[PDB]
Amino acid sequence: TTDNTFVSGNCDVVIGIVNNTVYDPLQPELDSFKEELDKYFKNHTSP
Amino acid sequence: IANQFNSAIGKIQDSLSSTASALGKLQDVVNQNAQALNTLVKQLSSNFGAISSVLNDILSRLDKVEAEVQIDRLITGRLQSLQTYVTQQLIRAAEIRASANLAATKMSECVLGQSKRVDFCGKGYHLMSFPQSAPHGVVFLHVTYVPAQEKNFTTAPAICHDGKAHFPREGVFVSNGTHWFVTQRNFYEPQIITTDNTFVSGNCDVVIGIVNNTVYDPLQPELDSFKEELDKYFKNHTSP
Amino acid sequence: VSMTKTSVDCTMYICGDSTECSNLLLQYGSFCTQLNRALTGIAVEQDKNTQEVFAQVKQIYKTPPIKDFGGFNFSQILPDPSKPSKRSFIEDLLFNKVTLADAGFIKQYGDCLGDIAARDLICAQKFNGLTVLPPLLTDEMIAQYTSALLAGTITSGWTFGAGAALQIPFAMQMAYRFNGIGVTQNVLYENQKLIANQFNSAIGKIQDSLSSTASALGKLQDVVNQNAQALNTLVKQLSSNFGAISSVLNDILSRLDKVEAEVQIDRLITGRLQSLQTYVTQQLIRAAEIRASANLAATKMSECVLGQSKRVDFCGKGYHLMSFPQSAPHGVVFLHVTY
Amino acid sequence: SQSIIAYTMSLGVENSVAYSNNSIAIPTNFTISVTTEILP
Ligand SMILES: *[C@@H]1O[C@H](CO)[C@@H](O[C@@H]2O[C@H](CO)[C@@H](O[C@H]3O[C@H](CO)[C@@H](O)[C@H](O)[C@@H]3O)[C@H](O)[C@H]2NC(C)=O)[C@H](O)[C@H]1NC(C)=O
Ligand SMILES: *[C@@H]1O[C@H](CO)[C@@H](O[C@@H]2O[C@H](CO)[C@@H](O[C@H]3O[C@H](CO)[C@@H](O)[C@H](O)[C@@H]3O)[C@H](O)[C@H]2NC(C)=O)[C@H](O)[C@H]1NC(C)=O
Ligand SMILES: *[C@@H]1O[C@H](CO)[C@@H](O[C@@H]2O[C@H](CO)[C@@H](O[C@H]3O[C@H](CO)[C@@H](O)[C@H](O)[C@@H]3O)[C@H](O)[C@H]2NC(C)=O)[C@H](O)[C@H]1NC(C)=O
Ligand SMILES: *[C@@H]1O[C@H](CO[C@@H]2O[C@@H](C)[C@@H](O)[C@@H](O)[C@@H]2O)[C@@H](O[C@@H]2O[C@H](CO)[C@@H](O)[C@H](O)[C@H]2NC(C)=O)[C@H](O)[C@H]1NC(C)=O
Ligand SMILES: *[C@@H]1O[C@H](CO)[C@@H](O[C@@H]2O[C@H](CO)[C@@H](O)[C@H](O)[C@H]2NC(C)=O)[C@H](O)[C@H]1NC(C)=O
Ligand SMILES: *[C@@H]1O[C@H](CO)[C@@H](O[C@@H]2O[C@H](CO)[C@@H](O)[C@H](O)[C@H]2NC(C)=O)[C@H](O)[C@H]1NC(C)=O
Ligand SMILES: *[C@@H]1O[C@H](CO)[C@@H](O)[C@H](O)[C@H]1NC(C)=O
Ligand SMILES: *[C@@H]1O[C@H](CO)[C@@H](O)[C@H](O)[C@H]1NC(C)=O
Ligand SMILES: *[C@@H]1O[C@H](CO)[C@@H](O)[C@H](O)[C@H]1NC(C)=O
């Protein structure tokens, strides 16, 4: 995760770097607020 | 911190100005070399069984072949006196090497660095040290943080909040009896227990002596301020 | 940490109870004062070594009457009240391994008045002016200082080294120690009963080792044996003739007149004075090894008991958590605890 | 009224540490101390 790791530079310079995802704990905490916010506009469009 | 350092360097002036005995480790080394040379000189006055101690009195009173037996005892006894003095000085010089290698190690680890070694650079947590010259020696003025005015607190190994168990990242949990805080271990500076001060592992079943308290998540008021903003704006946008 | 204090009365060794030998010994000047001075220097250095190793606390900590150390069982390394000299259970095992050869205590002459005096060398050493002297700290006082170092460690961790003792729960002290070796403190708490069982079992193996083998304390018995052997060798040089007509001083003085006797007594003086200067040279060189070991033992007391050491293999083989000091005859034992 | 006394030496002042399974002492303040060490 972005809490367990720190960034520096890009994939070209580090000998033996591997590709994997890095999870960001901020992302579901705002995507849950996103689908709920779309529901809140859907309720307000309903009447 | 500056006033305390300046005051403590003040006590070093006053102590060294007042007492006689503070440099005993150096004065004793001068006294041993002085006593060993005084002994080696006094030892010349011995007969070792010759008719005199004074080499010229033997040669003033005896012929070329009766003198040899008197002179050879003085040679034997004086040669044994030097072999003794030089053996004593070699053994002492090993104690002075050991002290110089310790002093060189303290110069490197207490002056040129900061030492994690307990009591190596003075009694306390070592900050830094200052070397000073002395006759045949070195003085180190070691500077140490000593913790001073303690309070008791109730404590726990972990906080339980959400079935999840929380531990400090750095520092220790404390309670004044009504509220729980996290503090750095060597200086009381309490903070609200948060997801930035703590980390989670396992669940509250395994930790012996865990306690229940809330854990603040500082993302929540940044989403709640953003929620009441949205709710008012939806109530406004139902009005036109 | 130390070796036996000896003092040798130069006149009683060289010239035992003869005045007309003592009047020749005076012609050699300062040598008997040099020998006394050198042996007194060694003897004072043995108390200094023991003070630098054990007297590292100026305050005498008591362990609590409750024993809630989070499952860790120090009862085998803390004092046992039920025995008059107040040592711990492992210190009594240590104290029984090293068989001493005098400690200077009250050898009150009537012991040296029997068949007992014939079977032992301590009376022969004493009668030839060789005397062992007692250490300044008794084994009671070493056990008290060791108890205070240990009670400070289990109740307050490293804090009594650096300042006032600050209490901390033992399982929280072990958590600070786990972070010290780079292992995250939840790894202690989620395993605390296993970490306590592995510690309690490992202290059990220390007893089983010390109780079974004869050889575990060999480094301390070697120091006792070298001191006793150097005194026995010094006593046996009183049987050498050094080219005199007899080795026994009173035989020369009964069999020869004042002129021819002094030619014979001078050989015994020369050989015996050379035997003492040999012994005191061996003892001064030895004392420098015992000092070097004491300054190391004091450095392990400071860095392994009063702290946690990052120095690899300095406080036992492993990552160092903590160490417990135990007193032994003329020495210290460290029980190093390692992850 | 001055005389030589003889005594068993004190090893240090006695102190029971206030240990408990849930008590900690934490320093609210510090002293910066300077101490002299002398080596030949
Ligand atoms: C690690 O992840 C990288 C991103 O997915 C990946 O880089 C991409 O690799 C492909 C295949 O080697 C390259 O493919 C393109 O390359 C050129 C055009 O630039 C064309 O000749 C090819 O036909 C094709 O279009 C990508 O250029 C490259 N992209 C980037 C941003 O570097 C790595 O290959 C991955 N490595 C491993 C070992 O998993
Ligand atoms: C344990 O530490 C706590 C934090 O220092 C402390 O709680 C705090 O207590 C004070 C009063 O002593 C409160 O002060 C505020 O009180 C009202 C709030 O409306 C105002 O009129 C005052 O101006 C002042 O701001 C704090 O609000 C309170 N903090 C919290 C988080 O509740 C405890 O009192 C301490 N307990 C012990 C036993 O010492
Ligand atoms: C810490 O906070 C916990 C959550 O509030 C709390 O756990 C709850 O404890 C009670 C009492 O032990 C349990 O009560 C139920 O337990 C059984 C049924 O499982 C019945 O015997 C009881 O009548 C009752 O129904 C709760 O189930 C339990 N809840 C959870 C989520 O575990 C802890 O007790 C608190 N501990 C401390 C020291 O404050
Ligand atoms: C830390 O607490 C200890 C002991 O716990 C307290 O004991 C009572 C005083 C009471 O307040 C309880 O609720 C606490 O749990 C204190 O130890 C005492 O110290 C005084 C001298 O200062 C001594 O007369 C007592 O006999 C001690 N009692 C015990 C059990 O040791 C200690 O003083 C507190 N620390 C600080 C810095 O104040
Ligand atoms: C700590 O260790 C000691 C010694 O290993 C345990 O003492 C034994 O306890 C049992 C049960 O009471 C007795 O039958 C034995 O005779 C004890 N042996 C000795 C040498 O005393 C002690 O129980 C342990 N303490 C705890 C709290 O578990
Ligand atoms: C920490 O301790 C220092 C002393 O080392 C305290 O400083 C003293 O404060 C009192 C008044 O409270 C003054 O009379 C002294 O003259 C101060 N001494 C110095 C060197 O400044 C300090 O107040 C303490 N701080 C806390 C937060 O307790
Ligand atoms: C590691 O060694 C293998 C051969 O065993 C090689 O194929 C590979 O490219 C090497 N990887 C790196 C990062 O050096
Ligand atoms: C501390 O000790 C008491 C008395 O044995 C016990 O009741 C309590 O549960 C213990 N606390 C912890 C955290 O284990
Ligand atoms: C109410 O909502 C409209 C958009 O629909 C916005 O322009 C207006 O400024 C809002 N007024 C307040 C008081 O928020």
Author numbering:
A (entry chain A): 1116 to 1162
B (entry chain C): 923 to 1162
C (entry chain A): 729 to 1067
D (entry chain C): 689 to 728
According to the publication:
3D classification identified five distinct classes for the B.1.1.7 S trimer—representing one closed prefusion conformation, three one-RBD-up conformations, and one two-RBD-up conformation—and two different classes for the B.1.351 trimer, representing a closed conformation and a one-RBD-up conformation. The two classes for the B.1.351 S trimer represent the closed prefusion and one-RBD-up states, respectively. In the B.1.351 virus, the S protein largely retains the structure of the G614 trimer with almost identical biochemical stability. Three mutations—K417N, E484K, and N501Y—at the ACE2 binding site do not produce any major structural rearrangements. The most notable differences are in the NTD, which contains three point mutations [L18F(Leu18→Phe), D80A (Asp80→Ala), and D215G (Asp215→Gly)] and a three-residue deletion (L242del, A243del, and L244del). The L18F and D80A changes lead to reconfiguration of the N-terminal segment despite the disulfide between Cys15 and Cys136 that partly anchors the N-terminal peptide. The most consequential changes are probably from the triple-residue deletion, because these nonpolar residues, located on the edge of the NTD core structure formed by four stacking β sheets, are replaced with polar residues His245-Arg246-Ser247. This replacement causes a shift of the nearby loop (residues 144 to 155) and must also reconfigure the adjacent disordered loop (residues 246 to 260), both of which form part of the NTD neutralizing epitopes. The triple-residue deletion rearranges the 172-to-188 segment with a movement up to 17 Å (Leu180). The accompanying mutations in the NTD remodel the antigenic surface and greatly reduce the potency of neutralizing antibodies against NTD-1 epitopes.
